[PDB]
Every structure is written in C-alpha cells, then in structure tokens.
Design a protein around this ligand. Structure first.
Ligand SMILES: CC[C@H](CC(=O)c1cc2cc(OC)c(OC)cc2[se]1)C(=O)O
Ligand SMILES: CC[C@H](CC(=O)c1cc2cc(OC)c(OC)cc2[se]1)C(=O)O
Lengths: 179, 179
C-alpha cells in the first residue's frame, strides 16, 4: 500500500518534477530544427505503465508498430552532487497500416520494475500495487503545477504474447489533435 | 517502515544495479587518460546520506573542502524506453589544510529528498525512515553481486550550520589505501 505510495511520490519528486517543466520546450526545439504536419512530436510525455510491471531493460515495446525514431534534445541540470546530470528522452513513431500515424516521447515508468522484483508478494499483490501506483501518480500529477497538458499515463495489460499498444497510444495522440 | 524499504530497493533496482558493475572501469579510464599518486580517484562510489534528508538540488556540499574537480566518463545504455540513457557522475577533490588529500566519485542518495518532502510525518519520523533506508540499502548492497568494493554509504547528520564531512569522507578513502 505504501511501497506504491512512496514509489509514486519518489518518481514524481525524483524525476517528473525535474523534467516536465522543460519537456515542452525541448519538444518544440526538435519539432522545428527537425521535422510533415502529422509527423510532429506530441507536446506530451507518454508514460507506459505495464500493469504486469514487466518493464524491459531495453527498448522492447513488443508492438511492431512502435519504433524508435530519434532522441530528444538532452536537458542538463546540476542535481544532488552530479554536475550536468543529463536527461535523455526518446521519440517513437506510431504506425497504422504500415504508415506513420503520429509521433511521441515515450518511456516506461521504471518504479514498476521494483514491484516486479518483489513479486516474481504474489502476482495479484503485484497487480494491486501497480494500480495503487498509477492512481497515486495520477493524483500527484493533477495537483502538481509542473504537470499541465505535458504528461499522460498509459496503463495497460497484455493478456498474452499473442493477443495493440500502438492503437492505445495513437488514440491519446488523436484526442490531443482534436483539442 | 515500508516507504523506506521500497525506496531502498528501487534505488538499488533502478539505479545502483545499473551503474555499479561498470563504475570501476569508467574510473580506471579517467585515472589513466586523466591524472599525482594521491590525486587518483577512489575506485568506489561514495553515496552521501544526510540523515536530515536535506539533499540539495545542486552541487552544494556545504564543506568548503569538498570541491567539484571533473566529471567521470559517461556511461550510456538503453533502459526502459530511453535509447542511450546517459549516466553522469561527478568527481570531487577532498582538501585538508588547503592541500588536496584525495579524490572520489560522490553523490547524494536522492530517494532521501522524498522522505524530506514527506516530513517538512514529523521530523523524528523523517530520521527513523532515513535510518531504515540506510540499513536496508546497506543490506541489499551486501548480498548484491554488483556490489563488491565499489560502493560506500556515507550517512551523517550535521547538528547545525556552524558545527567536517570532508574529514569523514577522507577517513573512508584513507582506509581504502590501507587495504
Ligand atoms: C528510464 C528513465 C528513468 C527516469 C529517471 O531517470 C529517474 C527515475 C527516478 C525514480 C525515483 O524514485 C522512483 C527517484 O527517486 C529519487 C529518482 C529517479 Se531519476 C530511469 O529510471 O532511468
Ligand atoms: C543524482 C543522480 C540520481 C541517480 C539516478 O539517476 C536514479 C535514481 C533512481 C531511484 C529510483 O528509485 C529510488 C528509481 O526507481 C526506478 C530509478 C532511479 Se535512476 C538522480 O536521482 O537523478
């Protein structure tokens, strides 16, 4: 109950509070200096929350239609001993019927792999802690001033290896255009 | 009790497990390509754990005798959506009587600023959660295979603004030489 609470706050306090306020400027810099009226990167950080807590230690999205396209201009800031601590972010192209249907900054919510490491608790405890985590992070980001149409939490659960994350994400980017 | 548990595991799982196994190689690369038989960077990551949980959002060590000297060769690895996620680390010179008495990679344990944010709980709850955090992290790092004379946890508490972190650290680096 509290592991998930504490991880949400720490993720917000140790990471999002630091990268969110400048994300939208880095994104416009890319969108100018680089880059099609559909291939413009969404002005939002999209945060992947596998409910099964299986966050890959690489780029594997398992969704043939989510591909790495470019890195974002890196932000640098001093933080907690580390001079010019670098903040790396990655842009992904989203495809529908083999065509590029949009583009966004994507990454996984890494505190979840700590819940995975603690269940691999039981698998049902894993799931409830992932939900609590999502619900806490959503509420933190709601009252958080650094969070103003710059952040979307994509929580999902694939029922098997053979069962469309791309479509899910794509819906969120469509709703951005129609707004 | 569990916030501190979970933050220790996440710090270990989200960060130390990823940077510790290569830290000592990055350190030798510096120690050759750069750099005095005393001015060689300690082959250890030193991790500052203010028990008061006051981790600065900058480089402030408040110890005139702990100064930024150089950055470490940055490590890059794919992780959790982010391609070539960069790992930045900073080297500090340690001074005694105005002379450089040693050198080490230093940084603060950032999960602590999440305990700070939650107490600024009461200040005594803050302190116990910081201790629990230290004790959990120490035990994790003991059975952790990635952690083999590459990591030291410096926990301390300054009683006031006018009251020697440098000496504390310096003792740990001396004990390394005499071993
Ligand atoms: C893949 C990119 C991420 C994003 C990232 O850099 C950080 C995550 C994070 C989480 C914390 O608590 C949950 C925390 O507490 C101080 C500090 C940080 Se920084 C990664 O995990 O490497
Ligand atoms: C100043 C340098 C640090 C070190 C660092 O990068 C990370 C810390 C961290 C902590 C986590 O839980 C506690 C976590 O859970 C996924 C991931 C990370 Se990455 C910083 O906080 O920026």
């Amino acid at each position: 109950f509290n592991v998930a609470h504490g991880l949400a706050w720490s993720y917000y306090i140790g990471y999002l509070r630091l990268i969110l306020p400048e994300l939208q400027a880095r994104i416009r810099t890319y969108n100018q200096h680089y880059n099609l009226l559909r291939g413009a990167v969404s002005q939002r950080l999209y945060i992947l929350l596998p409910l099964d807590c299986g966050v890959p230690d690489n780029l594997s999205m398992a969704d043939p239609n989510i591909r790495f396209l470019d890195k974002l201009p890196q932000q640098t800031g001093d933080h907690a001993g580390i001079k010019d601590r670098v903040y790396s972010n990655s842009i992904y192209e989203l495809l529908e019927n083999g065509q590029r249907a949009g583009t966004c900054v994507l990454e996984y919510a890494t505190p979840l792999q700590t819940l995975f490491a603690m269940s691999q608790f039981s698998r049902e405890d894993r799931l409830e802690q992932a939900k609590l985590f999502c619900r806490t992070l959503e509420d933190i980001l709601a009252d958080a001033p650094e969070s103003q149409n710059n952040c979307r939490l994509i929580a999902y659960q694939e029922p098997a290896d053979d069962s469309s994350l791309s479509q899910e994400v794509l819906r969120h980017l469509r709703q951005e255009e129609k707004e």
